[PDB]
Swiss-Prot record, chain A:
This is Hamartin. Highly expressed in skeletal muscle, followed by heart, brain, placenta, pancreas, lung, liver and kidney. Also expressed in embryonic kidney cells. Component of the TSC-TBC complex (also named Rhebulator complex), composed of 2 molecules of TSC1, 2 molecules of TSC2 and 1 molecule of TBC1D7. Probably forms a complex composed of chaperones HSP90 and HSP70, co-chaperones STIP1/HOP, CDC37, PPP5C, PTGES3/p23, TSC1 and client protein TSC2. Forms a complex composed of chaperones HSP90 and HSP70, co-chaperones CDC37, PPP5C, TSC1 and client protein TSC2, CDK4, AKT, RAF1 and NR3C1; this complex does not contain co-chaperones STIP1/HOP and PTGES3/p23. It is linked to Tuberous sclerosis 1: An autosomal dominant multi-system disorder that affects especially the brain, kidneys, heart, and skin. It is characterized by hamartomas (benign overgrowths predominantly of a cell or tissue type that occurs normally in the organ) and hamartias (developmental abnormalities of tissue combination). Clinical manifestations include epilepsy, learning difficulties, behavioral problems, and skin lesions. Seizures can be intractable and premature death can occur from a variety of disease-associated causes. Lymphangioleiomyomatosis: Progressive and often fatal lung disease characterized by a diffuse proliferation of abnormal smooth muscle cells in the lungs. It affects almost exclusively young women and can occur as an isolated disorder or in association with tuberous sclerosis complex. The C-terminal putative coiled-coil domain is necessary for interaction with TSC2. The chain holds residues 659 to 680 of 1164 of the full protein. It comes from the Eukaryota. It is found in: Lysosome membrane; Cytoplasm, Cytosol. It comes from Homo sapiens.
Swiss-Prot record, chain B:
Ubiquitously expressed. Highly expressed in heart, skeletal muscle and pancreas. Up-regulated in a variety of tumor tissues including ovarian and uterine cancers. The lineage of its organism: Eukaryota, Metazoa, Chordata, Craniata, Vertebrata. Belongs to the WD repeat PROPPIN family. This is WD repeat domain phosphoinositide-interacting protein 3. InterPro entries: PROPPIN, WD40/YVTN_repeat-like_dom_sf, WD40_repeat_dom_sf, WD40_rpt. The keyword Repeat applies. Coiled coil: none annotated. Signal peptide: none annotated. The keyword Repeat applies. Changing K190A: Abolished binding to phosphoinositides. The L/FRRG motif is required for recruitment to PtdIns3P. It is found in: Preautophagosomal structure; Lysosome. Changing T192A: Abolished binding to phosphoinositides.
Length: 22, 305
């Protein structure tokens, strides 16, 4: 169910680094 | 030069450049090159940022394919192609907004996007569209079919009727949203009058005049508190107005970039700063006093750093 939620979530919620450019 | 596109992000703290060999991401104030991912063959004509995260929306040379690029993974993660040409792309944490010459399509930010809404616009070759990224405000504003009118839509509560603002009487040339997503600026092709409306009401908050001669407006942007506003016009001319005082109709300051190349304008780190990114690869920082006079003045070629 966790993997099901992941594939149905926005990509910024899955793999992100909000300080990649700062 | 190689510069095909330049645009600010959502907090105006960074700006990205589409190049013939790839793309570059810069810090607005102070000027610093953060990333230059070349080898991207095609010629990037539009770059959209989602603040300082790793996802960038890129429009190729053919202008028929939107590509989301994960700079961390150094690869394209999402690719949406269109039969018509893509004029602009706007980003937010849960929605991907694509601007076409005749309509606006809102997709999801998933691996296989899901088109959620379709909004109709007039002929929009400039790609005029603004999208509030603030978590508490999913506002989308675009040119309406009524020539001169602006249509506002809340991407969260879509069932509510839209807001048709009879802004101007001619073709719209520029639109801008404040950082808080509460006020919108408009400009017609005549470019003699600038109008700011309330996004939650739809009434003329303030009207401002830049000049008598008809000029083509390029870029408009508020500051943080939406008290000041900067407007760029032909020949790299920038006017700085005050927005929260009906006792002011003109710009209290006005400057021109040294090269005279047309530019985009936004306020910098200092509260009295205005940054101008010109098409010829010029970076210009302008500091003004309360009366509007120039104090400091920084100029550099950002493409050569």
């Amino acid at each position: 169910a966790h993997s099901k939620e992941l594939n149905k979530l926005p990509l910024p919620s899955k793999s992100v680094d909000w300080t990649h450019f700062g | 030069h190689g510069l095909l596109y330049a645009g600010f992000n959502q907090d105006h703290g960074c700006f990205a450049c589409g190049m013939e060999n790839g793309f570059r991401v810069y810090n607005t104030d102070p000027l610093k090159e953060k990333e230059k991912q070349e080898f991207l063959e095609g010629g990037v004509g539009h770059v959209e940022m989602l603040f300082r995260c790793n996802y960038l929306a890129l429009v190729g040379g053919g202008k028929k394919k939107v590509m989301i690029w994960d700079d961390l993974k150094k690869k394209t993660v999402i690719e949406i192609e269109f039969s018509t040409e893509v004029k602009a792309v706007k980003l937010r944490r849960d929605r991907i907004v694509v601007v076409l010459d005749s309509m606006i399509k809102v997709f999801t930010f998933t691996h296989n996007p899901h088109q959620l809404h379709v909004f109709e616009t007039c002929y929009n070759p400039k790609g005029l569209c603004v999208l509030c990224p603030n978590s508490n405000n999913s506002l989308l504003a675009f040119p309406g079919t009524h020539t001169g009118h602006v249509q506002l839509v809340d991407l969260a509560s879509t069932e509510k009727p839209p807001v048709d603002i009879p802004a101007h009487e001619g073709v719209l040339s520029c639109i801008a949203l404040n950082l808080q997503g509460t006020r919108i600026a408009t400009a017609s092709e005549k470019g003699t009058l600038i109008r700011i409306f309330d996004t939650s009401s739809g009434h003329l908050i303030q009207e401002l005049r830049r000049g008598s001669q008809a000029a083509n407006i390029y870029c408009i942007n508020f500051n943080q508190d939406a008290s000041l506003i900067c407007v760029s016009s032909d020949h790299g001319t920038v006017h700085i107005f005050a927005a929260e005082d009906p006792k002011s109709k003109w710009s209290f300051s006005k400057f021109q970039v040294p090269s005279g190349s047309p530019c985009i304008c936004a306020f910098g780190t200092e509260p009295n700063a205005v940054i101008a990114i010109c098409a010829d690869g010029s970076y210009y920082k302008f500091l003004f006093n309360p009366k509007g006079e120039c104090i400091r003045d920084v100029y550099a070629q950002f493409l050569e750093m």
